[PDB]
Amino acid sequence: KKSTDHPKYSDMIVAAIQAEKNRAGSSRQSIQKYIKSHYKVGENADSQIKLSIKRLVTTGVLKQTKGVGASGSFRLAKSDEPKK
DNA sequence: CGTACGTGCGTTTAAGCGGTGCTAGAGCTGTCTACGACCAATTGAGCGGCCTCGGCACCGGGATTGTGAAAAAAAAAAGCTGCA
Ligand SMILES: [Ca+2]
Ligand SMILES: [Ca+2]
Ligand SMILES: [Ca+2]
Question: Which ligand has the minimum distance to the alpha carbon of residue A33?
Answer without folding.
Answer: 1
